[PDB]
């Protein structure tokens, strides 16, 4: 047994969905649509697994995310943690900026919520 969840690209884009069974040895599922993939997070049906990692969009669990990509269909992939960067470390070498930019960013915090009162009678 387990819960069932639906992986949905927004409906303002497409109506294809993939369905995840949380704890099934993916066998033990009566659904169709092919594209049956077994993961640590459950039985995923309808998403195409690919070997191309990418930035996470809709998370599934256990390192797996899904997205709607090329026409287009839902795919499953291992999430990337970012681009690699090998720093040219050396005992006699330093990098120094010769220019700069000014960046302004935005941070948002809640301060308050609606104040209510309830008459119990």
């Amino acid at each position: 047994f387990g819960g069932v969840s639906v992986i949905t690209p927004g409906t303002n884009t497409s109506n294809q969905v993939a369905v995840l069974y949380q704890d099934v040895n993916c066998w033990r599922v009566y659904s169709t649509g092919s594209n049956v993939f077994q993961t640590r997070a459950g039985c995923l049906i309808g998403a195409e697994h690919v070997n191309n990692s990418y930035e996470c969009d809709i998370p599934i669990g256990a390192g797996i995310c899904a997205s709607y990509q090329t026409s287009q269909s839902i795919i499953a992939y291992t999430m990337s943690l970012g681009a690699e960067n090998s720093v040219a470390y050396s005992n006699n070498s330093i990098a120094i900026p010769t220019n700069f930019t000014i960046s302004v960013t935005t941070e948002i915090l809640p301060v308050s919520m609606t104040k209510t009162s309830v008459d119990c009678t």
Binding site: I96, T98, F100, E107, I108, L109
Partner: protein, 211 residues
């Protein structure tokens, strides 16, 4: 960004949505029977005969009391989350707006210069202005310069070198200076520092003493 990306204000929209749902739930739980013959107190009062009405009324009371206790407990927990956010927002205004902060990534990514608050429904928006180093170059370095057997260290800077010459720059910006006795200070001899290199440290006054 704020105009084209509606998710930008999702934090404030979420506070509104959660409280709206807590109230809508309270309202809808009200219409459940909770084991009573009817959820409408007036139906019980209008047709059921008084001693039986007492029993059915009491079933509704228990159900409604549980609904209210659940609502209040949830509002107390949610209120605590809002208070924590408000305390953080107040801290940030004192430290990011009424000063300059050295706390890393506290007042935005990059080196903080200043911030400007803006009002928003049920919250505050901070515009954080930061300095970000841009295009860099690869320079050769050394911990010290060996002049006449004495070891010279920068007072405020880093020794760097291009393919043929040694200069001293400020750490965060490539603005090379001639290495002089005004830019460096002396401590110890040339044998103790590992990786010390030979250069000429210029005495800015000697030429006047010589002339």
């Amino acid at each position: 960004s704020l105009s084209s990306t509606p998710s930008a204000l999702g934090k404030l929209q979420d506070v509104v949505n959660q409280n709206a749902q807590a109230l809508n739930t309270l309202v809808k739980q009200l219409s459940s029977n909770f084991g009573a013959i009817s959820s409408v107190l007036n139906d019980i009062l209008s047709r059921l005969c008084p001693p039986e009405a007492e029993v059915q009324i009491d079933r509704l009371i228990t159900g409604r009391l549980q609904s209210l206790q659940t609502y209040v407990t949830q509002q107390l927990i949610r209120a605590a989350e809002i208070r924590a956010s408000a305390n953080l927002a107040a801290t940030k205004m004192s430290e990011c707006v009424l000063g300059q902060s050295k706390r890393v990534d506290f007042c935005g990514k990059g080196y903080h210069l200043m911030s400007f608050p803006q009002s928003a429904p049920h919250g505050v928006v901070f515009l954080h202005v930061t300095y970000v180093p841009a295009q860099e170059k690869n320079f050769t370095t050394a911990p010290a310069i060996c002049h006449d057997g004495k070891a010279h260290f920068p007072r405020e800077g880093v020794f760097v070198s291009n393919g043929t010459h040694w200069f001293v720059t400020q750490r965060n910006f490539y603005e090379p200076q001639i290495i002089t006795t005004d830019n460096t200070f002396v401590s110890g001899n040339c044998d103790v520092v590992i990786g010390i290199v030979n250069n000429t440290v210029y005495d800015p006054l000697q030429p006047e003493l010589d002339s």
